[PDB]
């Protein structure tokens, strides 16, 4: 069965990419824009933006390898390895023209290498709500005067003995609500039903493992990006971040200025990590305006 409701005018489909069967939801007409979700979620986080973008663009929203309805990767979970799959998927649908890319959270980790390595293929770029993996992330505090930090999960998820799978198995719904709401300012939008849907998807045993394998590969992605970042990004770029509890604040744009020559940024007040759901109206407006200019 489909894990999430598909909007009218969109199709749920699959494509084999380098031996890995990727799930995506596609609709609209025109130049291609690919939307890439992040941790704890699936293509469905984009379901409010997709019909609006589909008025002017062909829109494709894949499930990351191992998450949603996509098969796990065959190579590995580092950013360079996963970006191969996403690049080839986008190029199957836009072989003769560059495409636009919008990415959220670890979607950034899993697309940055193919952006920097195939710059001619990317017309415009939108990155929101996560650091590109580099040594800046080693400075985030573990514990705060406000209590539980927003980043202690980096170490928990990365632990090489699969501690996270071991402890969260059987408690997937409790943990996901904790994680999502503690990174949200607008907690109201995360209803019992929405959390149930996301929890069922990432509780699939291979998806729970895949979720944390992205973090187990994070230091490898850092090492990869230290080489890749010697070439700066030249296409027009926009960053978005939440300015409320749970967000990246000014860090998103400040980091991106070290990676991109042509970058504008926005911080959305009263919004946390989950921008498409917490602050859909202003976020959708910014993304559509940036891509439509």
């Amino acid at each position: 069965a489909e894990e999430f409701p598909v909007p009218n005018g969109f199709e749920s489909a699959y494509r084999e990419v380098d031996g890995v069967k990727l799930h995506y939801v596609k609709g609209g007409q025109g130049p291609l824009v690919m939307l890439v979700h992040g941790f704890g979620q699936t293509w469905y986080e984009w379901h409010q933006l997709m019909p609006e973008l589909a008025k002017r663009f062909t829109v494709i929203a894949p499930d990351l390898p191992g998450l949603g309805q996509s098969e796990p990767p065959k190579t590995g979970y580092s950013g360079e390895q996963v970006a191969v799959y996403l690049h080839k998927l986008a190029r199957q649908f836009s072989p003769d023209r560059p495409f636009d890319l919008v990415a959220h959270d670890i979607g950034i980790w899993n697309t940055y290498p193919m952006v920097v390595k195939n710059q001619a293929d990317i017309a415009r770029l939108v990155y929101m709500e996560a650091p590109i993996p580099d040594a800046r992330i080693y400075r985030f505090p573990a514990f705060t005067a406000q209590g539980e930090s927003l980043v202690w999960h980096f170490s928990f998820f990365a632990a090489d003995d699969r501690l996270a799978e071991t402890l969260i198995a059987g408690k997937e719904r409790f943990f996901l609500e904790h994680f999502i709401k503690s990174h949200a300012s607008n907690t109201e939008v995360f209803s019992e039903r929405l959390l149930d849907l996301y929890a069922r998807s990432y509780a699939k045993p291979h998806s729970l493992n895949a979720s944390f394998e992205y973090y187990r590969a994070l230091n490898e992605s850092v090492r990869q990006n230290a080489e890749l970042a010697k070439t700066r990004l030249q296409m027009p770029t926009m960053t978005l971040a939440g300015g409320g509890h749970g967000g990246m604040g000014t860090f998103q744009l400040e980091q991106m200025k070290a990676y991109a020559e042509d970058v504008e940024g926005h911080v959305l007040p009263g919004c946390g990590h989950w921008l498409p759901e917490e602050c859909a109206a202003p976020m959708n407006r910014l993304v559509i305006d940036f891509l439509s200019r």
Epitope: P131, R139, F140, T144, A145, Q146, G147, S149, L150, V151, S185, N186, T187, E188, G243, G244, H245, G246, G247, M248, G249, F251, P269, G270, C271, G272
Partner: nanobody, 117 residues
Framework: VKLQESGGGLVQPGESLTLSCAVS????????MGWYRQAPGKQREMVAS???????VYLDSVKGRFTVSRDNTKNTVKLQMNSLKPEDTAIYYC?????????????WGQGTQVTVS
Amino acid sequence: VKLQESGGGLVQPGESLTLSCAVSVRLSGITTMGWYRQAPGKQREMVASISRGGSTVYLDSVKGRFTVSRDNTKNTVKLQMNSLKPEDTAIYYCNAKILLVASTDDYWGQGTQVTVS
């Protein structure tokens, strides 16, 4: 993010006051709201704070007398001050802390004078 306190004034011992703080962003986007007071020449003290989940911290000498609360409908924070005493005279400030990934944001209102005489 902008905060504006109101509700201060001059009262006699044993009376009550209600301070309120208006917040320009969604209140659940504020990790901690803390009421601070400052009397002339004294060290500032944290009177009452409330996390967005509702955990409270109170200055010992106001426990049982003061109560801090959040009103997510009106998007305000309140400090109910009962059994006021001369020791409570001070300027009262509201402080908003916003926990982010790399740092914690810090915002303040301009304050309101409370005088118990």
